[PDB]
Amino acid sequence: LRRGVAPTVVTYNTLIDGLCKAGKLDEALKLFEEMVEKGIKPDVVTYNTLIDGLCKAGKLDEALKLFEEMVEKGIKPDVVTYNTLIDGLCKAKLEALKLFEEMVEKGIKPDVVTYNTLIDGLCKAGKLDEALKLFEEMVEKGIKPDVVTYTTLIDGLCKAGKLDEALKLFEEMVEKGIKPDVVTYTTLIDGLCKAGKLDEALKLFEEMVEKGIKPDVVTYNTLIDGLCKAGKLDEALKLFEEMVEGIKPDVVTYNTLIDGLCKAGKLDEALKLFEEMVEKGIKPDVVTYNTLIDGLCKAGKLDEALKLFEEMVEKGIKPDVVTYNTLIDGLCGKLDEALKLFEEMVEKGIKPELTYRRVVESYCRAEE
RNA sequence: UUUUGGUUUUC
């Protein structure tokens, strides 16, 4: 902190980076003000850091202001600036493409990260043909696809249902000497599980280790989820144990099991898992409470579901739109209660398709 | 010092 050593702009950028990635955007922004007050000019990296923090914190519009502020100052937005906005716009919407042409008009060549950012956006938007189009184009520009590039297309193909094309594209990635990492293998493993081929997924998982590729928690979470969906609830509890025998399970690990257990009716074993993660200092997020609220709702235990909603609120976890979609749906026949909860998420500041669909079908069989 | 890929919830 302090410090007879005068901080550099590099010093504030690091702290601003750490603050933004800790959600602490308001605290990340007072640092911005402090540094001008000392006569230390925020640079392009300073704006790019705050812009990224704003996008990932869902304040896209606030980030677009910062882009305008920097331009007004003569602090030129660069390839990183555009890459940051393009991803931010993709993840919110697919505006990102006008920036991809705008950056070229500023003399900024798009790079491998730009192409990777847009290929993913196009896939997650159902525009896989468009994404494959960009893949061809970047090889034309002499941009060499990397492990992220090939992993983004393998994911999209799988999620579109083109698992064998995914398997084919992975094959050529080793031909070109691009070494797959744990994210690559997990993506194929997730794809095989989503496609009902659990043993082909374990075969690959073992091939991942024999290649010397160490799994992480996502890998096991992916594998555990495949086991819960497949109905292999015990083999997924085995995997949760074997996991430690040295990977630390995380919240998503617990969320996945808690969900498998809820959907099977094993509400007890779910609640004691929810108790174990807390005691183990693993904080339940919003999916944790969403999973249990739906579980208790589908089971006919709405009072306990509402009880759990309060407790989630009584603990600083903010309920999102899934929370309300679940509860709103859950009250089928507490007409006004359901309607009540809809206005409450408006006042809380949560953008509502399912929400509207559920309220109207509630209004109708109750023309309002 | 800043930007891109993989896992869980409202079926």
Residue numbers in the entry: 42 to 44, 46 to 134, 136 to 137, 139 to 289, 291 to 377, 380 to 399, 401 to 414, 418 to 419
What wording appears in the published article?
To verify the RNA selectivity, the dPPR proteins dPPR-U8N2 (in which N indicates any nucleotide) comprising 10 dPPR repeats with different 5th and 6th repeats with different PPR codes were constructed and purified to homogeneity. After numerous unsuccessful trials, we finally succeeded in crystallizing each dPPR-U8N2 in complex with its respective target ssRNA (5′-UUUUNNUUUU-3′), in space group P212121. When dPPR-U8C2 was superimposed on dPPR-U10, dPPR-U8A2 and dPPR-U8G2, the root mean square deviations were 0.73, 0.99 and 1.00 Å over 348, 367 and 374 Cα atoms, respectively. As observed in all four complex structures, four types of dPPR repeats recognize their corresponding targets by forming hydrogen bonds with the Watson–Crick faces of the nucleotides, which explains why PPR proteins bind ssRNAs instead of double stranded ones. Serine or threonine at this position results in a preference for purines, whereas the presence of asparagine is correlated with a preference for pyrimidines. The amide group of the Asn5 side chain donates a hydrogen bond to the O2 atom of the corresponding pyrimidine, whereas the N3 atom of purine accepts a hydrogen bond from the hydroxyl group of the corresponding amino acid. For purine, Asn35 or Asp35 form one or two hydrogen bonds with adenine and guanine, respectively. The N1 atom of adenine is a hydrogen bond acceptor, whereas both the N1 and N2 atoms of guanine are hydrogen bond donors. These structures demonstrate how the amino acids asparagine and aspartate at the 35th position contribute to purine base selectivity.
